[PDB]
Design a binder for this molecule. Sequence first.
Ligand SMILES: OC[C@H]1O[C@@](CO)(O[C@H]2O[C@H](CO)[C@@H](O)[C@H](O)[C@H]2O)[C@@H](O)[C@@H]1O
Lengths: 553, 415
Amino acid sequence: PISPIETVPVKLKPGMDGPKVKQWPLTEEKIKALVEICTEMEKEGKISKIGPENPYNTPVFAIKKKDSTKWRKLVDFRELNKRTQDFWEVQLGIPHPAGLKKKKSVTVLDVGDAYFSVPLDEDFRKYTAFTIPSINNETPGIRYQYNVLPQGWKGSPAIFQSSMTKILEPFKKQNPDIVIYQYMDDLYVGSDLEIGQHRTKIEELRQHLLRWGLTTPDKKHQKEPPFLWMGYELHPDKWTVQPIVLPEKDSWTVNDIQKLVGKLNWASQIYPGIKVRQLSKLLRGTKALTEVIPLTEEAELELAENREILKEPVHGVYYDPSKDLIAEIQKQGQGQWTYQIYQEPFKNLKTGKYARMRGAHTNDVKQLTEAVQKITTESIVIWGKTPKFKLPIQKETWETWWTEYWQATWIPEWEFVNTPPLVKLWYQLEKEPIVGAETFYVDGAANRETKLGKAGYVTNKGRQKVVPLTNTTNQKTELQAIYLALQDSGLEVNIVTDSQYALGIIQAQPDKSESELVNQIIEQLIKKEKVYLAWVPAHKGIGGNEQVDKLVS
Amino acid sequence: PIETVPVKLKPGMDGPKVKQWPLTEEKIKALVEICTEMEKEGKISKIGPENPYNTPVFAIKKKDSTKWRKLVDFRELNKRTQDFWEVQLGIPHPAGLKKKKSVTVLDVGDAYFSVPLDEDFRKYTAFTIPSINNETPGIRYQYNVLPQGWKGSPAIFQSSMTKILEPFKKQNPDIVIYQYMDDLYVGSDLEIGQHRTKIEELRQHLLRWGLTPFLWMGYELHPDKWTVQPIVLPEKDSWTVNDIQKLVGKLNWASQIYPGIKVRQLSKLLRGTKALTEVIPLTEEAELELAENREILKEPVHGVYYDPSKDLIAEIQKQGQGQWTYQIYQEPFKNLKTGKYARMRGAHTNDVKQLTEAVQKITTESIVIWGKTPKFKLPIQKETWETWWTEYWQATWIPEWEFVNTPPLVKLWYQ
DNA sequence: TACCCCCCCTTCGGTGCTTTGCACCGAAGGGGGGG
Ligand SMILES: OC[C@H]1O[C@@](CO)(O[C@H]2O[C@H](CO)[C@@H](O)[C@H](O)[C@H]2O)[C@@H](O)[C@@H]1O
């Protein structure tokens, strides 16, 4: 006799009523296997047959369990889901093996038929109603309502999971010597107890769960390592991912590359050095999932380098609260970064990558900072603390960056590690005008309608240029005029523009850009020994600014 | 046996749904301890997923305090809660509080726990405690009493509050007392020792109700000594082309604030095409134009005053070398206050700590002066701020903020 | 022709200053993973 699981109150959204969707036509093989299942549910008390007073219905269908002889029953509740109250999901994140401490004794078991072991809300049951065709609709058929959490209902996971948690609560509290990781119905249990004492505690857990009606079938009960948990393999002193299958297929659809990049991301959490940039670039585009894609020379090299990493098996270790966390980052090029988190050398807790390109114009320092931030957050999720950082950037470089930059920025306690390629600032703008350097007053303009424009400059020595431009914009001409000044000037130059747009970009010291013209300017800036940029208001009759404004307007 | 003040939300608004952000080990440890104890005493109770609502929670240490303090970010609930100004429950703001020589800040929020909360409103106070490495799914609670950090709490409690302070106020009529959120601001013109004495009196006076984070702490302000940072034009004997270009840029911008400003004569000096470093003399006309501009910047801006119905806005600029400037306003180019901070905690090491301190200082000043917290425009990346700011936050309230990136083409508020 | 959680990469429309172009950012739909 089970202790009954108290029901969770559940409501439809205000002024909304239950679903009426009826049924779509079914193939006989499906309708057949279906009715045998409904009967078993009725018997075990998971479902009740009385239908006549119930106006509501929702479709049902079936599909085979993966590579199995068996047919699975699924209810499509999407319309009910809309009309049902919103829930707050209590699953905030995925546990990670690198967060587990080492345990002498370990067990992994699952709860059998989770959703169907939990009673549905009495008043909500009527809205779960569904209709099976008797035989191809010749005769009326069977009507049912769910007595427990149905598959397909948006509220089922949250409700089971929460009930699961309330049951476990007393058991954890009265056995502090145990550690239990509940992910949904899946349990990981570990202890430093002698295996006998541990085998005992597990069975107590098993009875405790049964008392509330939660079975733990022996088939899903893992006793001996390696334990298969959350997609990983847990050995006693080390963990790893379950084997990765790379398509070797010689003709790649859009969808092939998607799957490919997907698995590489998953691999990146342990296997160091994974790069998806060139592979992902094959994918950027309007192409439909079926369009076949030739692999670029670099993308093939990227895929090649990846395989070379995966050829070898890799293991992560477990977490030792006594020791500090260390995060070490390397630049992989093209805005790609990988890192390793570890406590002792050459034993990685885990690894990862940050390839994200945010913004049209950026540099390595901004990107390194972003990587630091992602790693800090990930670490707080898994270990609840911030790792000490080892970065390929010199202390002065960093000091020059963050002190001179106009946005607040910071990195937590870190030390320089000398591991080329190093992160550096590729040029630095003068704070004061340069004595004896030629002064370029630059300007550019474009016609809104024609998309034609000019860019040019006049200098204090009488030097002048104007260049015609086609299919352009005000903003582009403004950058263009600055480009000309840089091209036509010596190693030291003063440049005066009215363009807030242009100065905004350049003063942030970008080393890379989505714009070819900006990259060309960056290339010139790197060649210069000194550059002083200055802004003046337009249309005030300033300087050569009045003079160059007329030239290009 | 105390009846509950009924509370609604603004019509056309659901309750808060805001995801819990990751918490450090020490903060989760502190939260579990506090929430365990609060649960014993009925202040909070566990709930399920069937409550759609959530609010973020974390913990903080007030300045020079070694004990953790629970802080709920109610910013979303507070905006969605009925304005209690319409219910007349609003707290009026004394103009004389900023005039006092000393103002001490007491955290009285502990008192609010004594008052039950409307049953139908409790579902909106829902929060979720996370766990390290997601060992456990989130553990949800809701409030049975007036929560700290909720704008409704000081209002509903105001009745009781006025009563408790009545004797002290009447014994000491020259002392100003203002209530904002969980804090009590107590001003006086007395000598410090006398001031500190009367503050300790007010505390014991609070225990007399107590018998019938913690209250012992206090923080001293001196609003009489608060200063402003106006816009200033440099003084030079010789001016280069560059200097005059900057000055014209600065003046042309400033003309949005002070309309009577004129660059005509100075712009003329820029007539030719010249080397930036060339020294040029001012014309007779330009010297007066500069002088006449300087005076205009001495006098106050016209038709700028505080409107109680409008939100306050705060902008902050990083000036380098641990220097920070800010402006508080309601409508653009009409500034109610301008200021500058320097040598704060984290100066020349940590930008985010300094900015966090700046935000706290400005909010504190705004509360004292207008009884309002401004919405901040922060010079920083969203992700950068959101990563580190809870590490440095020492305040029981959280202001509104948004993120901006604004290159300083003119150095306007600092030279 | 179903349900809940997390991640990366891309695309696309809304939003506000760089302003009627350009930069930013969140949502959503592709993929990976978990139950
Ligand atoms: O940093 C802004 C960030 O915070 C969130 C989540 O906590 O919202 C909070 O901060 C906003 C800005 O002041 C408030 O408007 C909001 O009410 C509050 O919950 C996110 O919405 C936002 O991205």
